[PDB]
Amino acid sequence: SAFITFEGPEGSGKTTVINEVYHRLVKDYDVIMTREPGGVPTGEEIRKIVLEGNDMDIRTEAMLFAASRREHLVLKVIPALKEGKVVLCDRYIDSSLAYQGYARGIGVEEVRALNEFAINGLYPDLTIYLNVSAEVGRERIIDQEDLKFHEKVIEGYQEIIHQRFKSVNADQPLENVVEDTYQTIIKYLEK
Numbered sequence: 567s568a569f570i571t572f573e574g575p576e577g578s579g580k581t582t583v584i585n586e587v588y589h590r591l592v593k594d595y596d597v598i599m600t601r602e603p604g605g606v607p608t609g610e611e612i613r614k615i616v617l618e619g620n621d622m623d624i625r626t627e628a629m630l631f632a633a634s635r636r637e638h639l640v641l642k643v644i645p646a647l648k649e650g651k652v653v654l655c656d657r658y659i660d661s662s663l664a665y666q667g668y669a670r671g672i673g674v675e676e677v678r679a680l681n682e683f684a685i686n687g688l689y690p691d692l693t694i695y696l697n698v699s700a701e702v703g704r705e706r707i708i709d710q711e712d713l714k715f716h717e718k719v720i721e722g723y724q725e726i727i728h729q730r731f732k733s734v735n736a737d738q739p740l741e742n743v744v745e746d747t748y749q750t751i752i753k754y755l756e757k
């Protein structure tokens with residue numbers, strides 16, 4: 567079994583990369599693709615609070631992402647790993663660190679402590695960081711506030727990334743991003 571997370575800002579080609587890598591890995595491994603809340607009822611109820619209300623305090627939002635993360639881990643990820651599956655997870659602890667910790671300004675260390683409570687030692691075995699420049703990312707997506715937030719997210723990921731992390735150059739055409747990500751994963755799985 568293996569727990570592999572995928573991280574990156576918007577415009578990194580993360581959705582395409584995970585889907586293509588899943589279609590290639592399924593030939594040789596029992597693999598599943600997931601994201602939080604991923605159908606877990608409690609996580610889905612939390613997601614409705616976050617989305618359908620109520621122009622939220624950033625710390626309350628961080629705690630709700632962390633609570634959805636725990637429910638998804640306990641009810642979906644852990645049982646799949648017990649069946650010997652390769653779990654491909656779109657966003658995990660690092661997204662809370664970059665978005666809530668860095669970009670939203672709570673502080674990475676405060677958000678880290680919150681997330682360590684939520685995951686209780688269950689760190690990914692491997693984390694693919696889709697390293698896109700802000701400029702290429704901006705082009706893949708298509709105001710000043712959105713652009714600045716996109717840049718801060720990238721800045722946050724850079725601070726976080728500085729052992730389980732494997733940075734893939736996401737400025738390349740997507741076929742190459744897919745190939746580099748697939749090769750990184752197979753090297754880890756076959757080791």
Ligand SMILES: Cc1cn([C@H]2CCCN(Cc3ccc(C(=O)O)c(Oc4cccc(C(F)(F)F)c4)c3)C2)c(=O)[nH]c1=O
Pocket residue numbers: 602603609610612613614616617630631632634635657658661662665666
């Ligand atoms: C995992 C994670 C992600 N993001 C960002 C990434 C970029 C998109 N952002 C907006 C965004 C976009 C779509 C949705 C939707 O799913 O439709 C959405 O909602 C939820 C997503 C995941 C979990 C929950 C639940 F509430 F359940 F925790 C709600 C939020 C969310 C953080 O900021 N921190 C984190 O930890």
